[PDB]
Amino acid sequence: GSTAEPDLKTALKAVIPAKRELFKQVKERSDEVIGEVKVANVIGGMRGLKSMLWEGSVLDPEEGIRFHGKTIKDCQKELPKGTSGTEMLPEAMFWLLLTGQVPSTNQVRAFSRELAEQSHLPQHILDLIKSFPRSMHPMTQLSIAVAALNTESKFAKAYEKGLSKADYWEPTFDDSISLLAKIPRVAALVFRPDEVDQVGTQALDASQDWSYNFAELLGKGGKENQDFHDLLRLYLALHGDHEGGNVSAHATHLVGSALSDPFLSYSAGLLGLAGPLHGLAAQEVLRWILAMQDKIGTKFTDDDVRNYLWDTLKSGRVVPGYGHAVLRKPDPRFQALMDFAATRPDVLANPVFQLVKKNSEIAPAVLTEHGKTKNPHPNVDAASGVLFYHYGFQQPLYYTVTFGVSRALGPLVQLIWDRALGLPIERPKSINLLGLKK
Amino acid sequence: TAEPDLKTALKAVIPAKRELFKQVKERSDEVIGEVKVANVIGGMRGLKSMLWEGSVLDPEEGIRFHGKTIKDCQKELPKGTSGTEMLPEAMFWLLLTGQVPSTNQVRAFSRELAEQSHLPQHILDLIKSFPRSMHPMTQLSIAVAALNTESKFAKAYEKGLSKADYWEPTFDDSISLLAKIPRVAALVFRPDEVDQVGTQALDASQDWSYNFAELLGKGGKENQDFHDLLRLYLALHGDHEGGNVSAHATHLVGSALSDPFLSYSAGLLGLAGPLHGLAAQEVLRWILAMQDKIGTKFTDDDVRNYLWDTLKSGRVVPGYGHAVLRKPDPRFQALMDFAATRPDVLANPVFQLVKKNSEIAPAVLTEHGKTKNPHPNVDAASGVLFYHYGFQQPLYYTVTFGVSRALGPLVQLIWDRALGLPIERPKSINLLGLKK
Ligand SMILES: CC(C)(COP(=O)(O)OP(=O)(O)OC[C@H]1O[C@@H](n2cnc3c(N)ncnc32)[C@H](O)[C@@H]1OP(=O)(O)O)[C@@H](O)C(=O)NCCC(=O)NCCS
Ligand SMILES: O=C([O-])CC(=O)C(=O)O
Numbered sequence: 049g050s051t052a053e054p055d056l057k058t059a060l061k062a063v064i065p066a067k068r069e070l071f072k073q074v075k076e077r078s079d080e081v082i083g084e085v086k087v088a089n090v091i092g093g094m095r096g097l098k099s100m101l102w103e104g105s106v107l108d109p110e111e112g113i114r115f116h117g118k119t120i121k122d123c124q125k126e127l128p129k130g131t132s133g134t135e136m137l138p139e140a141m142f143w144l145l146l147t148g149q150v151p152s153t154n155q156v157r158a159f160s161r162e163l164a165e166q167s168h169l170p171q172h173i174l175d176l177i178k179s180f181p182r183s184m185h186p187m188t189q190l191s192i193a194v195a196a197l198n199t200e201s202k203f204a205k206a207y208e209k210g211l212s213k214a215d216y217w218e219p220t221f222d223d224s225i226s227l228l229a230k231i232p233r234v235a236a237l238v239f240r241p242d243e244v245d246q247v248g249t250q251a252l253d254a255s256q257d258w259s260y261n262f263a264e265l266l267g268k269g270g271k272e273n274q275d276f277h278d279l280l281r282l283y284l285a286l287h288g289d290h291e292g293g294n295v296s297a298h299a300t301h302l303v304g305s306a307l308s309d310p311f312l313s314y315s316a317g318l319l320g321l322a323g324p325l326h327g328l329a330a331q332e333v334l335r336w337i338l339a340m341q342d343k344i345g346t347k348f349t350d351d352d353v354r355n356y357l358w359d360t361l362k363s364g365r366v367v368p369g370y371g372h373a374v375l376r377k378p379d380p381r382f383q384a385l386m387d388f389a390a391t392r393p394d395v396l397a398n399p400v401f402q403l404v405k406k407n408s409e410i411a412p413a414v415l416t417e418h419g420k421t422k423n424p425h426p427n428v429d430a431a432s433g434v435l436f437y438h439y440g441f442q443q444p445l446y447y448t449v450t451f452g453v454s455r456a457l458g459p460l461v462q463l464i465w466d467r468a469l470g471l472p473i474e475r476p477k478s479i480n481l482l483g484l485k486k
Numbered sequence: 487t488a489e490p491d492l493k494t495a496l497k498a499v500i501p502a503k504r505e506l507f508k509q510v511k512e513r514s515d516e517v518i519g520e521v522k523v524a525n526v527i528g529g530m531r532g533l534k535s536m537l538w539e540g541s542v543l544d545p546e547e548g549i550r551f552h553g554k555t556i557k558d559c560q561k562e563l564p565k566g567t568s569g570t571e572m573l574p575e576a577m578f579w580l581l582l583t584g585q586v587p588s589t590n591q592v593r594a595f596s597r598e599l600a601e602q603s604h605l606p607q608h609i610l611d612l613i614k615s616f617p618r619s620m621h622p623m624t625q626l627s628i629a630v631a632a633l634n635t636e637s638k639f640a641k642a643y644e645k646g647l648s649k650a651d652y653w654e655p656t657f658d659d660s661i662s663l664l665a666k667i668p669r670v671a672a673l674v675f676r677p678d679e680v681d682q683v684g685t686q687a688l689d690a691s692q693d694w695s696y697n698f699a700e701l702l703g704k705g706g707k708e709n710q711d712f713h714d715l716l717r718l719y720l721a722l723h724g725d726h727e728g729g730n731v732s733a734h735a736t737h738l739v740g741s742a743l744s745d746p747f748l749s750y751s752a753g754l755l756g757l758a759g760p761l762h763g764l765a766a767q768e769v770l771r772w773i774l775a776m777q778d779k780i781g782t783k784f785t786d787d788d789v790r791n792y793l794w795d796t797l798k799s800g801r802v803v804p805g806y807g808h809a810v811l812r813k814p815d816p817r818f819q820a821l822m823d824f825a826a827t828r829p830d831v832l833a834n835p836v837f838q839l840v841k842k843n844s845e846i847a848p849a850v851l852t853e854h855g856k857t858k859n860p861h862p863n864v865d866a867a868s869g870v871l872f873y874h875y876g877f878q879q880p881l882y883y884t885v886t887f888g889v890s891r892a893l894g895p896l897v898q899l900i901w902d903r904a905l906g907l908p909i910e911r912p913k914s915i916n917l918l919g920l921k922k
Binding site: 067070071073074075077078079080081082083084085086087088089090091092093094095096097098099100101102103106170172175176178179180181183184185188191192195196198199204207210211212213214215291292293294295298299302303304305306307308312313315316319320322323324325326373374471472473474475476477478479480481482483484485 | 503506507509510511513514515516517518519520521522523524525526527528529530531532533534535536537538539540542543608611612614615616617619620621624627628631632634635640643727728729730731734735738739741742743744748749751752755756758759760761762764799800801809810907908909910911912913914915916917918919920921
């Protein structure tokens, strides 16, 4: 007889009927008015309009993101850690997002083993990646390679053969796990174009966690890189989900709603994450900080930072990494990253980190006095790029690739639930300016 | 001696649109609708929540393009140097500017599209890496994204571009993608001829549909009937307001300032879905499977039995239903009217089966009681007309839709950037939050 606790699919099966029951109850109230649509919502990219379902996370505009009601600090305490290190595992975060429950350490160990076993790639993906020119932006590469993995889609094949609507969730789950397992390897291939043959075939240690094995594929394996492993765990867990309305989450849900499989759907998500106003912001923050360091020097005072911020604003440009579309108060994800740095003397001594820290103390008041930026707290993008830079990722165009790995987590969870609940195609109505004029 | 070109014609109508936009924005606080639980749990169905300038879909009347019906466009838009069907590049002109171009203007724009059609070597190399198992829409989506190496917008933005000047590089990239996408599509159709098809000159005097046909191996005077089908087809599928998945995904990814190549790649990944553009492929597979089961000599009840088998199996009847339309789709009727004057098409047994199913399936769907619209959509009829003209692999049918559906969404990206529309970012909620 087996000794193991329930695996992830089994844990999911245990909670599907309860969610379907809740859905049925909500659907009885279909006709209830919950809001107003204004002209502003139409011309303003649906800002503030409650118009989509998302189960795993809810952004409290006053307190930051919660995952099934849990704060970041709650998850940091409760979720399992790796065999070494102190940071919460992203694969534990996935478990939580999907099931609504905190897994045991033993359950996470078993799930980590599955992810290691399912990480190999078809040879055509290696051929595809070798065809990319050096001029191709790393996010273009990543989006294409993920779409190309649709050759491996169980959902696409099952649907082509004739699949009942009731049976959509299971192959969606299977494809989601497959994509999760493979995406760090794909991302490593984007980072390491001269090592595609080795990185693309190397066996992972099946007893190590997803972030550790990503690090190994990036060339940062072993005990000497233990702090980087913990950075990566924390980073990947923090960026996994940020409710449904952000562009990458939304795009994934939207394309998935037409019953495109999870590889095509998350490829659309990645194309959104490649936008300057969404996932590329972390790349822009770090470029901006290095350009500030170049102009003010390393002897900088508070006044030098204040003057630089004012010059930036007087020039009609933004201070990147400050502000948010929805959250109006300090980002707990930002604080989590700064607290990771607090206990690492080598990071605290990095002059580029010291500049990020000082800027985070001074900028919010300057931005407030200026009055053009709403919600002028530092967001998580203020800190993430510098931490990667510290650990030797100093290629200006690659920072969003790691975000792409993380942001598979939440949107894939919602695709599984979308299919389990039977949600229909996302298809709103449009109107033209003439029609709004009356 | 030359009439205004497309960019110039666009520049002339931008100020009036910006004036209209300002007038609308003064009324930002006007309530125009209600959000209900149904809208949240039901994929935004019935929620009027996004802007789209070039077309507006009436649930009862079908699509209008700047207030014009399909029949209006068929009569008014310029034709090719041969044939009687409206040109898709004329449709693009109309969608973008709001004005019907002269024939001379269309001829000049067609020549630009032919000139801008060539592909860089790395795109040919990428395509030759595709395995034979790869679905044609996966191929098309990837190759379009890969063309982002050629994006003027992406490069200009990276260098520092003022918001007021976003539209011009967006326009330039849109035209580049339009010019290139039929050649990309032909490479998907012709995997063993990438080197030749990927470099061959287009006929500089011919229209966009003609040159697509030639790249597909259906050039010349002997294929003039097919060129007219293709013109009509490409024009009909160009735009269907903003809320369809491919249009919406293009707008959504574009709204984060991803360039037109990345944004329309996202559109194509949506168009690849069984409930959206892949339904054209799905229809013909289902029609052929029905023909195989019921035979050559069959009754109405044999067709009914096949429809009910599909429904009882938990599957959709492809080519029936629509998110917005509540009557038979006038794009469907335009394709059936194309067939109506061609005795060889009407006599094709696969066409006869599509026609018979269109007389039976709406009643079956009504009896079943799930669908809000039992009537045929355009996907019921498109694939069989390609089949008749010799395109007999249904896994490629959506690729031609991919070529057509660049037209409308690229127009809206240009206007999105000209007007300065912001990122699309709704708010979500969980079921527990709706229950409270
Ligand atoms: C076009 C389509 C996606 C619109 O979706 P929609 O707006 O959610 O459709 P409805 O409001 O009519 O859906 C209500 C129910 O009817 C079902 N239904 C709709 N069209 C159907 C069809 N053609 N065959 C079987 N069932 C259908 C839906 O799947 C849904 O099921 P549920 O309530 O049991 O969960 C849908 O009609 C469809 O799937 N059609 C077949 C695919 C197709 O032809 N697509 C191309 C459209 S141009
Ligand atoms: O939430 C948003 O709108 C943007 C986002 O994904 C993030 O901040 O992680």
